[PDB]
Structures are given as C-alpha cells and as structure tokens.
Design a protein around this ligand. Sequence first.
Ligand code: FMN
Ligand code: SF4
Ligand code: SF4
Ligand code: SF4
Ligand code: SF4
Ligand code: SF4
Ligand code: FES
Ligand code: FES
Ligand code: ZN
Lengths: 105, 244, 192, 434, 95, 73, 111, 79
Amino acid sequence: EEHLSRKVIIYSPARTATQSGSGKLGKWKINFVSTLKWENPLMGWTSTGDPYANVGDSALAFDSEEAAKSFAERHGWDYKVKKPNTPLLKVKSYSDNFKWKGNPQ
Amino acid sequence: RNPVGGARVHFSNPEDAIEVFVDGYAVKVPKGFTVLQACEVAGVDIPRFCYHSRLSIAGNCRMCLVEVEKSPKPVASCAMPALPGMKIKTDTPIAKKAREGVMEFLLMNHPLDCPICDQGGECDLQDQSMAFGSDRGRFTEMKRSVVDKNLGPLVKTVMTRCIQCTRCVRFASEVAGVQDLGILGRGSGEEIGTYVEKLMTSELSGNVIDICPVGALTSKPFAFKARNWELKATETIDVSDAVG
Amino acid sequence: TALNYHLDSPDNKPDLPWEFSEANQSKVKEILSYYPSNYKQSAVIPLLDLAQQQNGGWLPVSAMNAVAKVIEVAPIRVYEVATFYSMFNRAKVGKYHLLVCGTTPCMIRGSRDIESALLDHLGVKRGEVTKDGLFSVGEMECMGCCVNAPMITVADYSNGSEGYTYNYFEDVTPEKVVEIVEKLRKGEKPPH
Amino acid sequence: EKTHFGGLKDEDRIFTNLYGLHDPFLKGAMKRGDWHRTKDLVLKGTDWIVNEMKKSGLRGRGGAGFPSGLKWSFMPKVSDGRPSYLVVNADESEPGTCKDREIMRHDPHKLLEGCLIAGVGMRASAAYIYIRGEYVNERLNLEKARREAYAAGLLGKNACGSGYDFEVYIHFGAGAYICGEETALLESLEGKQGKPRLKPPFPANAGLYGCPTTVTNVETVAVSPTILRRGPEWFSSFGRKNNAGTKLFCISGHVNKPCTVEEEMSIPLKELIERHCGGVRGGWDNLLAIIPGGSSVPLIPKNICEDVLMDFDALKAVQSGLGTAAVIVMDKSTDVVDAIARLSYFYKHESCGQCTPCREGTGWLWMIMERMKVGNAKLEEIDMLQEVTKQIEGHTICALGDAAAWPVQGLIRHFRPELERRIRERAERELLQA
Amino acid sequence: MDNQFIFKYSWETLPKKWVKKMERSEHGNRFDTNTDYLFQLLCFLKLHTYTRVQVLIDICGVDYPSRKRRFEVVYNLLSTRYNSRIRVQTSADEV
Amino acid sequence: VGNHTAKWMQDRSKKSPMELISEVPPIKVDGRIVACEGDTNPALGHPIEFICLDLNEPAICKYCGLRYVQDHH
Amino acid sequence: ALRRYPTGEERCIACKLCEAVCPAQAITIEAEEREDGSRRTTRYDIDMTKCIYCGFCQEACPVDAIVEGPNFEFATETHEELLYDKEKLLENGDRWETEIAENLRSESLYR
Amino acid sequence: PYDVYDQLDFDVPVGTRGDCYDRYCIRIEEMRQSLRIIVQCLNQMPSGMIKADDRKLCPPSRCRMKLSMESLIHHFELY
Ligand SMILES: Cc1cc2nc3c(=O)[nH]c(=O)nc-3n(C[C@H](O)[C@H](O)[C@H](O)COP(=O)(O)O)c2cc1C
Ligand code: SF4
Ligand code: SF4
Ligand code: SF4
Ligand code: SF4
Ligand code: SF4
Ligand code: FES
Ligand code: FES
Ligand SMILES: [Zn+2]
C-alpha cells in the first residue's frame, strides 16, 4: 500500500576502480533510494525509520535486467532503468613503446 | 561466452580477424589483440598487476603468465600478441605453478600491514593470494624496508607496500603529462620517487591512488577513515565543471 | 651511503647555478652530433660523465638539471639514469678517487688485504673525503679475471675533464698502495 | 682434423696481434692484412656476404651461439623508410672475461673493418660500438683508430671508395652488468635505464630508435673480414660440425700459467688447460670443479671435465654452456659453497630489478646461500633452494634470471653431500656446545 | 538400498509423467515434480513395497525472486525400512 | 590534548596515549634496519614490522608508536 | 576491555576486523589519522546489551587490543551504563591488565 | 554414522510398551551408554591437529598470523 508506490532504480553496479578484477559485475539491483537517516542523540549512532534501508543491497538481487523489471512491475513500483557502461577493447601492442620518431624535422 | 566485464569488441572489418583457442574454446578477436585480451573475450579472468588497459604495456610483474602450445617458456599474456591457431591454456599445472611462484616472490618483502593498510578488503594482492597462490609461507629471512616519501597533501605514501609495477610512473608520463614520478636505483633496492623533494602538482594526480594495486599510494584525506565493506556505493555524476 | 633520493645541502641544492664550461661546449656539441637531433636523450650518459669530470668527480643535483636541459628531457629521467649506474658519484669525492675491495674473481686470491691499510694511512673511513679534499675511498667494480693482481683503481678528477684518467693498477700490496698515494699527492702519475 | 681438435697453428689464427707486440694502429693493421681490398668485398653485395657468413658456420660469440649468417639475414631487404642500425656489443661485464677487451686493445681495426663488413651485410647505414664504462683507455684507443679510418676514407661517406656510406660511432656505458644484454644495451643507448625489453618485438624489426637493428659481439664482428677474405670453407674446417671455426679462450683460476689464447673450437677441455696453461695447480688429480665459460653457466665436476670438448653442443649436453669461453678452474682447496654464494651475491647486485622473480628471487637465493655457507640451515632447505631456482628460471624477462639459478642448480646437482655435511657439522657443534 | 538402486528403480517403476527432473548426487537423490502430481508421487513412495518411505522429515519453502514460480517447496522424506533418504521438490508462485 | 583525542577522552588527570608514546626516547640501533614486534614475546605483540632508519628523523613503528634511530650514522 | 602497550600507547589500530566479524553488530568504530600520523580510533563503542559474549572479536583482533576479560560482576541500574564507550573500555583494561596479561600468557600455548 | 561413532561400542535401548515409563528407562539407559562412549573417547583420544589443515577455511595461529604474510592475509579474509 504505502510502501508500494515508491519509485526505484534498476541498475547493474559497475566495477570498483580500486581493483582490476571483474568478478562482481553482471548482477542487477533494485535501488530503493533510502536517504532518510539521522544521528541518535545519545551515542551518535545512525538511525532510520525506512524499512527498505538495506534490503535493496543485502538480500534482493537479480541475475538479469528482465528479472528485476518483472519483479518491480509485479509489486507495482515505478522503476527507471540505468544501463551499465562497458569498456571498449582496443588494439594494444607492446611494440608501440618503441615506435620510431621519424626523421628530425 | 560473454566477454569479461561485458567488454565490447569492435571490428573494423570481419576480414581483419583471427582465430585463437582459449582453454579449448574458440574465440575470434581483432588482429593485434594480445593473448590477455583474447582471454578476456573468452571470458577468462587472468590475474595481473603491472598491466593497465589505459597505460602502455610493461610486462614486469610476471603474474599474467599462461601456457602457450609449442612455447618453451610461460608467456606473459599482457604483452604477447595473439596469433592465428594459437592454443592458450590458463589452468594447467605449469600456469598454476608459475602464478604460485610469482605470488611467493611478491609477498616475500611485502609488509604485514593489512590491518593498518587502507587497501585491505579491496586489495588485488589479497584476493590473488587467496585464489592463485595458496602457499603456506616459507620465507623466514629479514624483509627489506623503505622510507616513506612526501608527495603533497593528497597522496599518502607507504612505500614498503610497493610492488614496483610502475603503473604510477607510466600514468605520470602518459596520462597526466607531468613527469615527476620515476623509478630510482637498481635491483631490489629500487624505489619509486621524485628523487628531489617535490609535490605531485598535476590536476589528475589523485588517479595514481586508484591505479596503485597495493596500499602504497592512498588518499591522505581518506586515510584510515573507513573500510570498503561498510561504504554504500552510489553511481552519479560530477558537477564541478561542464564535463559530467 | 648511497641513497635513492636527495636532501638539500648548501653545496648541493637545485638553486645553485651550474652549466657546461665554455671549453666544454665544444665537447657537448660533438657528443650530440653522434645521434639524431630528435634523439638527444642518447647523450645522457656521456654528458653525465663529462659533467662529473668538470665538477671534480661527483654530480650535484644542479649538474643533473643542466644535462636534462641540454638533452631536453624532464630532470626525473636524468635522475633515473644517474641512480641506476654505479659509475656516477652523487656525493663529494676527493681529487683522486681510489676504488678498492673487489668482487668474486679477486677475493679468491685474497683481495681483502688492501682496503684497511688504505684507510689507516689516509685516516678516514670509506665514503668520506680527507680534510685537504684530495683522497676518498670507494667501492671498485671489477672486470677481467684477477689472474696476476690483487688490484686497485684510481680516478683522477684533479684536472677537470681535460686531465681525467681512469687507470687500473696491478700487484698492489699494502706497501705499494701507499707508494701510489704519495706519488699521487706529489702529482706524479703512478706507473701502471 | 675430423678426429681430434686442438693445436691451432699461427697461420690459422685470426687475431694476429693478441699479445700486443706490434702496432695496433692503421699502419700496422694494414701491414698485418686489415682493410686489404675492402672495396671489392662490399661490391659483392649484401646477399653474397650473408651467404658466405652462412656457409662459414659462424655462431654468435656472445654466449648464445646463434648462427651469425641467419641472424644477419633477419634484417629487412627493402627499407620502409626507417634506417638500419648495427650495434656492436663491447660491454663485457661478465667476471673472468677479457677477450673483447684484448680485441679493442690490439686489433681495433679488425673491429672497425668488421663493423663495415657487417654493416653492408645488414644494409645498415651506421654502426654504434657500445663499450664498457671502465674501458676508458680502450675506448680512447678505439677513438684514435676510428679517427684514423675516417681520415683515410675507409669509414664515412664513400667507404673505401665503394659508394656505400657507413658511419661508425662510439658509445660507452656507466657500470652495469645487465647492459650487456642485447635489449638492455639498446635501452641504455637510447639514454634510458638499462632494463631489458620483452620479445616480441625483436630487434631486427624494432630495435634501436624503433628501427631494424642487429646487436652482435665484438668477437663475432671482428672475424667477418678474415672469414670473407680467406673463405668460409677454411673457417668451417676447424671444429666439429655445427661448431665451426676458431675461438678466443681465456683460462684463469687455479692453473700454473693463466693466459688468453686463440684455439680451435671443440678442443678438449683437459687438453686446453694442460697444453697452454701448464695444468691444474698441483696436478689434474687436484681438480675439483671447472666453470667452462663465464660465471653464467653451471659448473661441471672432475669426472665430466675429463673428456668434454670446448664447443656449444658438447657443454650443452652436460648441462652447461660455452658462454664467453672464460674458463675458471677450481682445485680441491677451494670452498665451492663459498664460491657459489659469492656468485649469488653478484647476480643479486647486478639484477636490474625490473621483473619480480629476478628482483626478489636473486636476493632470496643469496640469503639462503650465505646461510648454507656456514651450515645454518635445515636439510630440507636444500630441496627448497632447488625449488626457488625453478620459480625464477623461465619466468623472467631476460636471461639474467636463468643465469642466477644455474650456478645454484649445479652446486646442488654435483656437490649436495658437501652441503649436507656442512649442515651436519654445524648441528653437531650446536648439540655439544649447548 | 543405496542411492544407486533408488535412482534406477524409480526410473523403471514410476509413471513417466510424474517426474520432470532426477538428480543423483552425494548431496542427495532428488525428484522434481509438477504440483499436480506431488500428492500421488508421495503416496506411491509411501505405499510401494520397494520404497516404503514412511516418515516425512519436514517441508520447507525457498524463495527465488528471479523465477516465474518464485517458491520452491521441498519435501525431505525418510525410509527407516531401507535406511535411505529422498528429496521431492516442486515449484509454486504467490497465488 | 589534540582534537583527535578530545573526541573520546574526557579525563585530563592522566596524559593521553599520544603524549605517553611521545615521551619514550627513540631506541638506538646499530644498523639501517630494525624489526619491531611490540613485545618481548612475539606472539603477544603486533605483526612484525621492518623499519628503515636511513632518514635523520626518528622512524616510527606504525603499530605501536615506538621510535628508532641509527646509533652511529 | 581495551588494552594498551606497556608504554601507555593503545594497542588498537582501528583495523575494524572486530566490527566486521561481530555476529550481533554490537561494535561501532570511527577512526582517523592522529596528529602524530598514527592510525587510531576516535570512537569505539560496544553495546553490551546487543553483544552475545562470543569472543569472536578477541579472536579477530590482530594486535590483542580488544579482549573479553575475566570480570562477570558488572550488573547496572540503567541501560545506558551498558553502552560502553572507548574511555570506559580503556578504564577496564587498566583495572584488569594484570589478570588479563597473565591469562594471555597462559593461553598463548593453545592459540 | 558420522565422526568416529563407527569405532565406538554402545547399545541402543528400545522400549516394549511405548508409554512414558519406557521413555524414562531409555533416557536413563542412554546416560549409561553416553558414559560408556565418553570412556572410549578418553582412552582412544589421539594426538594431532584439532583443525583441518586447508589454508582457505581455518584461522592461522596467532604466531603465524603475526609472522607470515600469507597467514595474515588469510586471517584478514577469514574474519
Ligand atoms: C645478463 C646478460 C649479459 C650479457 N652480456 C653480454 C656481453 O657482455 N657481450 C655480449 O656480446 N653479449 C652479452 N650478452 C648476450 C646478448 O644478449 C646477445 O645475445 C649478444 O650480445 C649477441 O651477440 P652474438 O650473437 O654476436 O653472440 C649478455 C646477455 C645477458 C642475459
Ligand atoms: S596492499 Fe595492504 S591489504 Fe593488500 S596485502 Fe599489502 S598490506 Fe595487505
Ligand atoms: S607505488 Fe603503487 S603504482 Fe607505483 S610502482 Fe609501487 S605498487 Fe606500482
Ligand atoms: S631477469 Fe633480472 S635482469 Fe632480467 S629484466 Fe628481470 S629483473 Fe632485470
Ligand atoms: S563478544 Fe565481542 S564479537 Fe562477540 S558479540 Fe560481543 S562485541 Fe561482538
Ligand atoms: S580492537 Fe583490534 S580488531 Fe578491533 S579495530 Fe582495534 S585493532 Fe582492529
Ligand atoms: S600483467 Fe603481464 S606481466 Fe604484469
Ligand atoms: S680485486 Fe679483483 S676486481 Fe677488484
Ligand atoms: Zn612496534
């Protein structure tokens, strides 16, 4: 009812820039944009009242773009799809390091 | 098979393509691709440290060694061009043993710093040690040690962790266009530095933090503040200029 | 005590002026003439050698910055070269650099019988120059096969680039090495 | 002859001024036969010179022993705009070798005429002679000989009146053993750190300045004119098949009279030491181990030395190499474990540090070998020492990493009981003392 | 009565339309069936002389959000007569 | 006394740990390298840390804060 | 309890291993570079009412900084007194150090 | 059977009436059989490791973790 009209983002998380390994891609997430948190005035702990605080990152997951879209539409959420960026493999040669500079101009 | 990371491959012409075998499976790559790039198209993840797609090939870490048929030695896939009919094997006892031996040499002088190191939890060296070299350590001698260097208020330096991949040096020359970083000395005593005391002034200097595979170059303003597993990641855009 | 970095000192800092002497500009020009004009960097090693000869046998950071200017490269690329090769001295040596205490081929014939006598007659430790600025003792690098000689090397930086000599001496004994030092002090070139 | 090899006569010797009794300069060199009718040799064309080199069976004298003619033929026939370079390797920093130094000292004009002959045989417009940094006196000798050749018209534009322009320049190093490696020499000649390159590219396709390049030893280059003038069949008449020609030998260590001599290839090692160098100090029975050529090949024990011949194939079959033909002889009084640990120090010191298994592994080998020198090790560390050598070998950018593992591998293979005993004696001293 | 005998004998004797998937493994012999046949398959296994599956250890559900029928219902069963266990699974959705 | 300590320490009777480790004099070492374990019994200390002493200023163990210097040069 | 080195410096270097392994999520840590460049916590809270007293934190710590000591008599009259901050934990370490150190010497032969 | 229950001697008491009194007698008899098993475990207890040696699943010792890079990496990953 109340939590079924929130709008979500369906996306496939990119690769971390701090590591060269590509083993965390291919997954599709549903982002609930839970951005209502504050500090508890006793210990400084981070508080929330939003039930979808971490379920979008901890438990819910999808192996395909279609599966995430189907799940969102069955529950009635308004979704926007962000297509992932992919690298373009280009021709690289080690011999390029020693390319001739040509005749002196 | 899906190329690693979903990477796209562009073909100038279907005529300009060659056939190689990656672990028996057959892949088609453009002419001029390396053995490592062919392995990515096959969907096989080769371990690497010195190789960066956006930097010139160096071939010094020796972690990308694979077995090539009719080749007498293990082959550094990051530098070796792919040839038609090439048979590339990555999980053979020769390739696995090469990876374990190199990983042993990498950790020989590496400092026991994972607890105090900001790369901990997002470290290629940690992940590849757990995966490829599952060696019980047998190095009992004295480790080498290096003094830290001052590069300014953005890049914190712990140079005992450096594995001498030269990604930072190559980035400084090729991408930043400011030639301040070099590799000084020779042998196991070689040190990355600027030799004379100078700060990294390039406006792209902070990118050496991302490319350093170990915690040798880290963000000074982010130092010790968080572990990567406790951070929520949001994909967005920058509004500091008109580039997005 | 060679280090892979530099710390500023009054006689070695980047703001000290340093340039090739007018009598050395001709040598600089002819050295550059051996290589394509867009491949000047090939001259870094002979130019660093000439800078070392002019500056009394060592390279201050200003001398390195001067070579980098001639070959038109960033100074870090010159620092890489000067630190990689062992023939370049980045700290002060005496007018006569004495190189001793060889490697594998000469230790078999007892090469470690010459160094201590040298420091004892000279009155310094290895790596530091004498009070009069004449002699320093350094690590020799060996060639050949060490067949008939516990040997020593003498680098003569006492007459700039126009009197530089780099000679090897054979059959050197704890006596004979001293005879070399005394002739070197008096100016006579010892026979080799 | 075909049966036995050795006893090379004065008349078949190539380097006729090895002992420095005559003048090494232009007047004396022409007297001995250098620069004799050089114009006609180069007018026979590139293809003829390469063919004669191929027929002569000349192999690379820098240690690898690659066939010289096939290697010259790798150079492009038609230029794609890029010039072609010849580089002469005169950077012999290997302990125990002085053959190239003696060539530059007493026959510089052989090197200079070999430079031109090789340059025509490679279609190269210029040659660079990379000399070792500490060969200061040798370099000044070479520059004087070069100035002599330029004034006489033998070098430079219209070399010897033939219309082939050939420049010869002289470069020198600054004290690094690794710079003798062919690709590291190229980098050092470019003004960078002497760090070897990976292959491919190969130097014949992208070498100096990214231009087609051949790097060859001083000895290989200095013998091409004499092979051309006397004919390939005379040169191939010495040595066994595939090991043709003559070799410069230098024998040091525990011999009665050490000397550098020029001798027929494939001469028996025992004959070589007993005929030119008196004999092992104390007799042949006193011999313990011999390093055949240079400290970059494994040692061989006494039983192997008895009939092994000094050529590429014979020493390969007993897990060694000809190398630089620098014969180091050790009698029974030498501490072989100390000698190997001393070599392990040299390779750790001389490693350029570029690649991981050599940069880190050479230091590990030295540390263990220093511990094994006094027995401060366990018996199972000998097996571990063997495995660390295998982790280095074949996994490095260049061949210095292999040359670091070979002396240790030879020690374990031939003198393991000596290491085991040193560990036992130390353990016995530990038990009683405390 | 080992898992080799159960897999083979069930293939020969069960009506073919009941079982859509058969997995023989050291993790457990598993029979996947359509929902309309689950009751009959469980009555066969209980009453048949060569199976005698008399004990239902438990029934559990598993949620698979990426599937059209997101729920998997798993029946872990036991034969004390033949000292053997069997897993029978079927899929279901929210309605 | 600093801002880092004032976030948690609300008692000024004792000195802060940053003050206390600053008063331990640097340890003289004969050599250019020292290994620090943080304890006499290595198993009760911190992971072994090798510290280079080539710089004039004293070198700090990144685990326990002990400072080391070269004794002679 | 939180422990110090004999010099008075804290053992904890804010690795956050204890926070990650804690099955009850009872540990909260904030850290930053200290004025002398040291890697130290500015906040170390254990909620004693969420903690299950499993000892996983003490196993995970690489520098023997956090320990479960021998005290079991610490009942309180308020819930907030069982929210331990960093200073309370370091006070516990000072009071119980002699017994904790002896216990660690005893158990160092098994771990 | 699992672990070392196949190398141990014990009886399995069963009832004959299936009422509360049999189940009481079985639980009493099961404590006597548990006592019997404990004695055999005490006597047959061998020396050796108490943790599987594989270095991907078991924590290193404290001394190893503080002295070996590989062990520290494994400890960091495991916890
Ligand atoms: C560490 C190392 C040092 C070398 N030093 C020399 C050298 O001093 N002189 C030389 O001719 N070749 C040396 N080489 C061999 C060269 O790489 C190359 O094979 C040789 O110069 C080619 O000469 P050649 O074909 O005429 O024999 C060295 C190789 C290595 C790996
Ligand atoms: S870089 Fe840091 S986290 Fe990675 S292995 Fe080295 S010390 Fe551990
Ligand atoms: S500092 Fe980092 S990027 Fe630079 S060489 Fe060392 S490990 Fe590589
Ligand atoms: S093997 Fe040794 S000398 Fe050769 S490139 Fe590698 S580190 Fe340098
Ligand atoms: S004992 Fe320590 S690890 Fe266990 S729940 Fe409590 S705080 Fe967490
Ligand atoms: S108490 Fe130990 S495990 Fe927890 S953050 Fe501090 S050092 Fe790390
Ligand atoms: S990744 Fe190919 S060698 Fe470093
Ligand atoms: S004493 Fe032999 S080279 Fe120095
Ligand atoms: Zn410490």
